[PDB]
Amino acid sequence: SYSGYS
């Protein structure tokens, strides 16, 4: 998974 700001 991805968590945060892109």
Length of the chain: 6
How far is the C-alpha of 2 from the C-alpha of 5, rounded, in Å?
A: 9
Burial class (CB in 10 A: 0-12, 13-18, 19+), 1: exposed
Q: What is the resolution of this structure in A?
A: 0.7
How far is the C-alpha of 6 from the C-alpha of 3, rounded, in Å?
A: 9
Q: Which residue has the tokens 């991805």?
A: 2
**Count of CA atoms in the C-beta half-sphere (13 A) of 4:** 4
How far is the C-alpha of 6 from the C-alpha of 2, rounded, in Å?
A: 9
Query: How many whole angstroms from its chain centre is CA 5?
Result: 5
Q: After which residues is the chain broken (C to N over 2.5 A)?
A: none
How far is the C-alpha of 1 from the C-alpha of 5, rounded, in Å?
A: 13
